[PDB]
Symmetry: C4
Subunit: 389 residues, 4 copies
């Protein structure tokens, strides 16, 4: 009946599943209406996986595709594609207008959620199947926004992280608890809770969720939020490892102080992701990504640890380079593939493609999942934005 | 088994679901065969919603797309798209040739109905699943025509409003009662029944339907038709509110006399729509749309009331501007999304796009549904017809 | 379980269902890969109807589409489209290579059949679901060929008419009896059996089939073949009505002699079609089509009769002009839409489109079904072949 | 429940099913994004057949399609199409990144497998449904690679042939045994086991599999591998017939010595295929293909035998020319169509299309299945690579 977390399929590393690269088809002579997009992610039901992303109501090539750099507008929608379909106009399915998104399947229906509206009074609407069942207004009146990756559903209830407030300062996240798309409760995030953008969330066992977020103001350490779905509580932490996962970031280990010490820099950031191995009782290993560059959104490097990331300052263990440092690499996202026997967690990579500041902007998506013992290969795009017509 | 009206999902306002904007993809350099169309509407089964519209047997860009301004021809067909698929040639499904349309799902199969033929001897054909099961000839021999929005099915019977006669004068509507697409009875509309074009109809409780129509000859007040499906009776009214919903219209409240008093102007009009909240016994709130302009089809403004619209002359309560007054806004349509637990009603907006008189003509469709407490955002097209190639 | 003929849905005339017109989208500026084709027909299961046709392994516009006039080649395939999908490359489903085709659903699976090979040693292959289950070699070594319209399945067995031999002389048709695509018997056509091309076949009651064919050598009267599926017998007749249905043809009634008298002319011909009303015991009315012109394949006119067409020389009763006489009109085909309550028969029209002799060739398909009391409207293409790019 | 081999449908020859020829649509004026590809094959479930192939993350026409000659890269993916859909961008489904592929349905889910990574440390990943369940690293560190045709599943276990090592020398194949995509055992190939590339495998009865492979270093005779799935053993043989099936090859019968004698030449080769007739206990006839030319990959000729191909040096019996000798013909592949009553085996043909050395490269796929008594027709492409735009 309801989706719930199972023990994960055996795996000790990350290996490539697939890559979608629609703008390979947007060169001179090509015959395709490709869909430029940003903030992509994947979510799955027991029947299918889907690539969700935020579009711009436009295809490339085309005269209107110059707006694709914008973060928020009346054009953007949460749309999706069967996973493995290329990102073309005829493959696209529009779910909700809006400029920040999440989605997740509870075992019976999809919940889709976007934020729509002006920056000072935006509204999250939640769609369950075909109906808008939930509505959640801005509480801080400063760009209400959500994860840009899948939410987590356990036992008929789905858990969505939202935040509202200055992107350059204190902004308190909330956990929304939904049932059939209706917001039935809010969970207050206690502890280290002054930031937490764009959380990537995975169940750590049968009843707990862990979210890896972005602190856009205070620290190059990533916030971690843990949700006890049985108690209905959530607590914020700061990831303690010397291997800081955000971008930009200082040199590894150089932030002096306790685990929850911010560090001197910390302005800016990027959405990050992780994957894991777990039993029904505990997470046994975590897999992390960060950029190659400590200053720019370029490259992707995988790491792993069996330590508790909220407690240990130990460096993470190098797995290897999934995207070379010369290649733009922007957001990354967690997702889980539910199975009949075991579940599997994965990391997707937004390999960014852009002509420059306030010019055409999109991406290619590469997907790596927890399986095997060593990284198999790195990913490239072989797309030169100058060639996009 | 059969579709029947349930109590609606909680909601106290209208908020945006999504928007389809196919001709964003019809600019220079684009690679899409988009489908120019007019009179769009949405209807849903328990399995899916579909965007229905009347096409012109042509895609844009293309040499033949200059006929898309025509109301009636041998080219037009009732076609549909899965709701959320963009309006492209490969996504299109053709149901019936004809130039006026309606469709509705009874819980087992779709009923599709169009009027086809010459103006003086047109025939409505009704298709149930794959078979043409019903045929209804013109009775006034002057453009037999129907709702341009979904019909309503209750307990295995569907209810369709048709009209026939001068668009500039008295034309008596009829309610057709269908079963598996066969016209099994006609219901005579009593009361205020001298007009009633393009009705948007929704169940007001378990057994009654209310239709909001267009009086194209006599009044800027919209006719309302109520159907008792158990008694098999229908009565026409004139909407009494000082907030007149048709376009063009005089200033609010300025029509002197009783509720059913026509007013001095009233020539012309536009299809209108409403949505509602209801229990199994009664409608508890109604939501209405009209243009911003009192003379031109531009803008869309939402209103609400808990009054009986056939009795009270009270002004409606302003919800807000869904489409700015500088933006063309033509037809609007009601539809209902059936649910396993509750039903939901919505308003769709035909945001018109045209190069001018007897030139290329189509639209973008914006959808708002009953949910939340305040209007979230207004809709734009960002399509300049001059840019369509 | 198995498909079998039911009594037909009430109807006393022919009225338009829909029209597919893919090459409306093949003009300058258009963005569609349309599928030029000839010999189209429709067949249905209980789940869906499909438009079948013979393609040329090419789309229009395109450099190779100049071969589309050819009757037979190594390029042609039996392909199909969900009925109502337009005839574009992405909508197409290829079933079997070959240059003469038929298909029919037995209630469990599709049987598809084409003839493939050189003119003097062609082979019919029959595909049941995904497997080639049947193979039937040429017996007269002179263009083995079949109906170019749907076959008929009753009680798990399907009935296919084939012919082999000179198109300008005596060629004896055979009825193939298939089960799961395997040819399990051949039925010898007795009686008037010296010709019978391209039969359009419909059940006349629970156990009999009637086929309306083309005599390409001897007569402007159409051969009729009746199959008793219980006895496993088939007999050929010549349609007796003074209203001769083939093209070219002499003036009505001018063939002197008995019903089976050929008449002096008779060379050439065109595939024809009919529809009917029936109970489980008998056919109660038949509907026929022929061209407007008695010398050229132009126009389509509908007729009806309650007489036995193998016995009565009475003129048929005029229903009216479905396609004006200025419009090319080539093949027509019978098909049946099975229903849960009643079946429905229909006639489809190949409205031909061509640039001329040995130049680009295709069509638009218009569909009329048995329903209502009067013809509703005639069909046009509004496609000028000169405009096809 | 589980797929297992049934007795095959009656048939004594090979006859054409269908052909897919996407680049017919890639000429001047065309409107299609076609998918250039190599190493195509077909695999089927009980629900559908699919055309699998290895793409290049590009469509034709398009600026990037010049890489399509490459064997291995970070661009290639195992993708598939419903069998009968043409090979266009919107029809494509991406399964796994990688440059060598196989896939097979076990009755419940698809197993897809590709090799990904650098030549010296490639990794096979196996995807079962939506999850990566298996991972198998290179064991000889020299282009780990697999069949380029479907694997075989029997009783819930699937059998995949892999090889690793010098393509110009001794390279030992292994049989991987998978369950839900997990590699549960490896079977050592005994006997004649020093080579065995790109095996085409079919069940020979209820519990045994036979694979026809390519010896790329030592012999123009094809290796044959037989797997006893009950014992879990596999043995390699050399095909003994005087009719040598590889290309290039010496004149028939001219290799002096025993069945397992290599012969003096043998460098190079091409993937080959066979089909068969079988009961539940034994294979009763085998059907083979080889090129027309003994030196170039051109033409295709069918043969048959009732002898044991590992024992008898008798020449095979000529069936006939399926592809004329002037037409490029590269890989061929075996596949089986499972049925409710009987199974059917087939041979597919990669009719190669290329502009030349290190230039644009793709193919057309022709399919022949075991049915009938004589070859019906040969296949052509009628594609001139010079015309591809
Ligand atoms: C202003 C707050 C930002 C999040 C920390 C901002 N989010 C939204 C909803 O606008 C993101 C940020 O500006 C962009 C990025 O860092 O790449 C993407 C952008 N995200 C979206 N456009 N959805
Ligand atoms: C002449 C009667 C009119 C309805 C009041 C007319 N309806 C039809 C069937 O022609 C509508 C009207 O002329 C147009 C409009 O007002 O926008 C649309 C147009 N509707 C359609 N073309 N379907
Ligand atoms: C030579 C015998 C003819 C049938 C009487 C011929 N049939 C075939 C299989 O070639 C038809 C005829 O030449 C053409 C026509 O009359 O329109 C179509 C053509 N039919 C097809 N090309 N499938
Ligand atoms: C180097 C080993 C070769 C197999 C014997 C080589 N295989 C791979 C995985 O590269 C094949 C060979 O080079 C090409 C051919 O012979 O056509 C195809 C090519 N196969 C693929 N590109 N998948
Ligand atoms: C999941 O983990 C949390 C934190 O370690 C623990 O309190 C809880 O009991 C665990 N749940 C189960 C079902 O073991
Ligand atoms: C629906 O409303 C009508 C009009 O108010 C009323 O007569 C009827 O009884 C109601 N139906 C139900 C089931 O309450
Ligand atoms: C169908 O019609 C034929 C010919 O008139 C007749 O012989 C047969 O009995 C009929 N079948 C049934 C089931 O009535
Ligand atoms: C299949 O064939 C092998 C080899 O001939 C034989 O050993 C085995 O018994 C056969 N299996 C069955 C089920 O007959
Ligand atoms: Ca930061
Ligand atoms: Ca009016
Ligand atoms: Ca004739
Ligand atoms: Ca060799």
């Amino acid at each position: 009946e309801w989706r719930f977390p199972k023990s994960t399929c055996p795996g000790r590393s990350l290996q490539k599943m697939l890559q979608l690269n629609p703008h390979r088809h947007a060169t001179a002579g090509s015959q395709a209406a490709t869909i430029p997009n940003r903030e992509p992610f994947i979510s799955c039901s027991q029947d299918e996986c889907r690539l969700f992303t935020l579009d711009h109501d436009v295809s490339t090539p085309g005269a209107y595709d110059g707006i694709t750099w914008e973060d928020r507008s009346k054009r953007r929608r949460l749309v999706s594609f069967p996973l493995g379909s290329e990102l073309t106009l005829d493959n696209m399915k529009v779910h909700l207008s809006g400029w920040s998104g999440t989605a997740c399947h509870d075992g019976k229906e999809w919940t889709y959620a976007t934020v729509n509206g002006p920056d000072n009074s935006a509204v999250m609407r939640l769609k369950y199947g075909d109906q808008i069942r939930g509505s959640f207004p801005s509480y801080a009146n400063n760009i209400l926004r959500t994860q840009e990756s899948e939410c987590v559903c356990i036992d008929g209830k789905c858990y969505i992280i939202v935040i509202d407030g200055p992107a350059g300062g204190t902004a308190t996240p909330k956990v929304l608890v939904t049932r059939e798309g209706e917001v039935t409760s809010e969970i207050i995030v206690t502890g280290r809770n002054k930031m937490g953008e764009e959380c990537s969330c995975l169940a750590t066992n049968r009843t707990w969720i862990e979210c890896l977020c972005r602190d856009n103001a205070f620290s190059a350490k990533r916030p971690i939020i843990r949700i006890d779905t049985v108690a209905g509580t959530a607590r914020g932490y700061l990831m303690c490892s010397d291997t800081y996962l955000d971008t930009p970031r200082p040199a590894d280990g150089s932030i002096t102080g306790s685990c929850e010490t911010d560090g001197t820099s910390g302005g800016g950031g990027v959405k990050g992701a992780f994957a894991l191995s777990r039993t029904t009782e505990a997470t046994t290993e975590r897999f992390y990504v960060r950029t190659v560059s400590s200053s720019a959104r370029s490259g992707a490097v995988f790491y792993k640890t069996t330590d508790d990331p909220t407690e240990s300052n130990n460096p993470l263990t190098l797995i290897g380079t999934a995207v070379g440092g010369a290649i733009p690499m922007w957001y990354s996202f967690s997702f889980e593939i539910p199975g009949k026997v075991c579940d599997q967690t994965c990391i997707g990579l937004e390999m960014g493609l852009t002509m420059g500041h306030q010019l055409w902007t999109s991406n290619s998506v590469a997907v790596y999942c927890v399986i095997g013992d060593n990284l198999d290969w790195d990913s490239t795009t072989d797309v030169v934005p100058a060639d996009i017509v």
